[PDB]
Amino acid sequence: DFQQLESAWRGLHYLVNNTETDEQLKIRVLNISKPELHKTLKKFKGTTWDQSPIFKKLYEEEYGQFGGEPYGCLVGDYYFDQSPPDVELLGEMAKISAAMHAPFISAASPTVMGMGSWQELSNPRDLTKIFTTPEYAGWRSLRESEDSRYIGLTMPRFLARLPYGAKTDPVEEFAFEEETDGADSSKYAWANSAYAMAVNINRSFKLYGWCSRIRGVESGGEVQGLPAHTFPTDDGGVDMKCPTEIAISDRREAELAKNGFMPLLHKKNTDFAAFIGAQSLQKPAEYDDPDATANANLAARLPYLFATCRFAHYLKCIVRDKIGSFKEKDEMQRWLQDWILNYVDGDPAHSTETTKAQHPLAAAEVVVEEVEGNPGYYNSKFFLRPHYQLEGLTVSLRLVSKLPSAKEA
């Protein structure tokens, strides 16, 4: 009990203290247990989902209200497994978060892998085989959904605080030892890593105005200053407890990002840690045309969904304020076309560094159509091409006597 509450308030405190809050950044907390959230979201399901305490708060009072706050990103602070109740909760929160354009971020329980530790993550040979069984039928049905791209999951949870003791973090009230002998993971205070992702999102917004860069080692997905608990061991000694629960190899990392997780992996022998990539829960479907497959892959990545969500907030507010102004199809075309075009950097697209983070779009295209049988109502389509981010690279090195490109020709 004390570890659960301590981890909750300790994670929330990490999110609060590490965030630079001002007029632009706010943090609103709702205290609701996972059973209460699943209960109230279970009361309203199917048709009645539009009416819920959670949907009222998240959508009506803010994104739906005139002159409200579109609510940005949402952070779950819960551990979701493949169980029926957690699949229901994720389905519903994906409906809400999809309606309000507010990506949902939470942590994936160690029980998703049929594990219960995250200390055993290195044991299985193939993680993709875990999710094949009929036990996960509900999980697979969730990932196939189109509303699941609004849900991220960060499996490993980072260390909240350094264990009390004379050597580290002395209490100074009385001589105190926290025990916490090497590993076993039950003695340490573990904060949810949805909060590290959250801190990364708030940081990204504070610096760049957008949530576009919340991933990568050097691209802004770094989690620094992690408590490093060093305890002596046999022989040479001096081995430290990993800040995230376990070390994830690049193969494990890519294998988890394929399964729709956001791993937090810890750099070896350092207190540094990072999110290599942000992949939503949605499994992007393959298509015949490679362009459709590309568009299907972009939608599954949170870095882009934050961009489009932000444009949804902006468009909502500015159009809501433009209601009642004299507008034709051509007038709306010029106003939307010239409004979207100030977030695009046209001339400097190849040569730029930070402005690519501040201007999230490489190009923008608007198609406006007036609804027939009605004045003043229009339909619009926004085609916006984001700045691509390096995802992976396969290199084949070749020892060559005569260069095939130039020397040999």
């Binding site: 009990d1 004390f2 659960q4 509450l5 301590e6 909750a8 308030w9 300790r10 994670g11 929330l12 405190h13 999110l15 609060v16 203290n17 809050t21 632009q24 950044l25 706010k26 943090i27 609103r28 907390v29 709702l30 205290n31 609701i32 247990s33 996972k34 209460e36 959230l37 109230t40 305490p53 009222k56 708060k57 998240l58 803010e62 706050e69 579109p70 609510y71 940005g72 990103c73 949402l74 952070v75 779950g76 602070d77 819960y78 009390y164 209490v171 009230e173 009385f174 105190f176 926290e178 959250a198 999102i201 708030n202 917004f205 949530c211 932000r310 907030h313 902006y314 507010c317 409004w339």
Partner: protein, 132 residues
């Protein structure tokens, strides 16, 4: 917001009417729209009262300023039985309500449980006794 100079202009105008208006070529002021992050979490686990019904909880703004006021207002508490290592016996039922972020520290934990409070006070009286 139609400066009173415009009221003087349109309503009863002097022959010489001098107004000041800000020059904006393209108008179109910025949308603003700050970034809010709503957070949902399990807090005040096992409360002592019915607490509050859903839809009445709302979302409360939090920051570094009101954080401790958010704990003290929310009254997070914990109640459970724990084995008593002090004097044999058996499970020791402790009731703790944390009113500040410092109340999760082991010192404050000891000060809140009444028995550990008596022992800790004993230690401060003896350690304060050995020094003058």
């Amino acid at each position: 917001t139609t400066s009173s100079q415009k009221f003087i202009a349109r309503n009863r105008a002097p022959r010489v009417q001098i107004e000041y208006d800000v020059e904006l070529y393209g108008a179109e002021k910025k949308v603003q729209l700050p970034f809010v992050m709503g957070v949902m979490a399990d807090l005040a686990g096992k409360p002592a009262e019915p607490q509050a019904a859903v839809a009445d909880r709302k979302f409360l703004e939090i920051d570094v300023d009101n954080f401790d006021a958010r704990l003290k207002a929310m009254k997070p508490r914990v109640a459970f039985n724990v084995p008593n290592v002090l004097t044999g016996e058996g499970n020791l039922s402790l009731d703790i309500t944390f009113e500040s972020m410092d109340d999760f520290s082991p010192a404050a934990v000891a000060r809140k449980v009444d028995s550990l409070n008596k022992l800790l006070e004993a230690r401060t009286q003896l350690a304060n006794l050995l020094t003058y």
